[PDB]
Design a protein around this ligand. Structure first.
Ligand SMILES: [Ca+2]
Ligand SMILES: [Ca+2]
Ligand SMILES: [Ca+2]
Ligand SMILES: [Ca+2]
Ligand SMILES: [Ca+2]
Length: 318
């Protein structure tokens, strides 16, 4: 079902590749084309072996050399591509948090689209890497119901997917109805508990029944009822429950759609999902925005950046 765009190379020889990267960097200037062409053609696992061979062959650090050679968005793109899979999200998170300011958009985006299983792994990796607790870190950087919603999510405790209980679907839909529209003010607590812990197949049935019952889609009530970070967060959770590929295909679009471009987001989503479901994130992008992801990047990006990007994504028509 899920499908990425980048895969393992068939005739992979880590040693050969490491040499191609040395030549491409040795001497005056760089062959940014030889780098971008090689790296976006190997799975992330293979990129770790290549970086291994490079050290054992030349006693040099691949990532550090490139950090030295490449620049701007291309660097940032290659540097993110080199990051080990099990550590990238943890790396993006630790970076949204740190500093004086936080990037809630990253916290929301990562915490909402990632499955419980991935939330757990992301949690282990984060701790072993920066010697800190992810929760403790988020809690300390956020507040209000936004913080509570995140923490509920960080528990990666969401209920399991069993046969749907109708009476239970009705009870939950009616509960959300009374907690928002039929209430003077909002009972965010109920939204947080039901949205953050119920099983996926269940909540999907709850979204429909709630529409039937109120004439609204849960998304509109959320918008009518809430505001700020909690709003964006809850919209993010509802979207992912419906379809992560679609929710991510949507946040990518809004990164480019605007005049400029949010390269950070554009980079993060493509890289992070390249080997998970970037293929599906592609279909949902065409179906809902009429354009293929390809053509959209092709128009907003440039340089080797644009070249690497399009090769990771690929597929002109979607
Ligand atoms: Ca050089
Ligand atoms: Ca540089
Ligand atoms: Ca209300
Ligand atoms: Ca609003
Ligand atoms: Ca633009």
């Amino acid at each position: 079902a899920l499908r990425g765009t980048v895969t393992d190379f068939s005739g992979f020889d880590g040693r050969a590749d490491a040499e191609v990267l040395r030549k491409a960097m040795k001497g005056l200037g760089t062959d940014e084309d030889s780098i971008l062409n090689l790296l976006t053609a190997r799975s992330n696992a293979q990129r770790q072996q290549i970086a291994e061979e490079f050290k054992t062959l030349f006693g040099r650090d691949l990532v550090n050399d490139m950090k030295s050679e490449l620049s701007g968005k291309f660097e940032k793109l290659i540097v993110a591509l080199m990051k080990p899979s099990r550590l990238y999200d943890a790396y993006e998170l630790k970076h949204a948090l740190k500093g004086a300011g936080t990037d809630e958009k990253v916290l929301t985006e990562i915490i909402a689209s990632r499955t419980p299983e991935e939330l757990r792994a992301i949690k282990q990796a984060y701790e072993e890497e920066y010697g800190s607790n992810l929760e403790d870190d988020v809690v300390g950087d956020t507040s209000g119901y936004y913080q509570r919603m995140l923490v509920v999510l960080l528990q990666a405790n969401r209920d399991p997917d069993t046969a749907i209980d109708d009476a239970q679907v009705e009870l939950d839909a009616q509960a959300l109805f009374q907690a928002g529209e039929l209430k003077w003010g909002t009972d965010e607590e109920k939204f947080i508990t039901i949205l953050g812990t119920r099983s996926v197949s269940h909540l999907r049935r709850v979204f429909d029944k709630y529409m039937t019952i109120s004439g609204f889609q849960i998304e509109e009530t959320i918008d009518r009822e809430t505001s700020g970070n909690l709003e964006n967060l809850l919209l993010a959770v509802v979207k992912s429950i419906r379809s992560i590929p679609a929710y991510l295909a949507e946040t990518l679009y809004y990164a480019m759609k605007g005049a400029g471009t949010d390269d950070h987001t554009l980079i993060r989503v493509i890289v992070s999902r390249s080997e998970i479901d970037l293929f599906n994130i592609r279909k949902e992008f065409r179906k809902n925005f009429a354009t293929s992801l390809y053509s959209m990047i092709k128009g907003d990006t440039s340089g080797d950046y644009k070249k690497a990007l399009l090769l990771l994504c690929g597929g002109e028509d979607d």
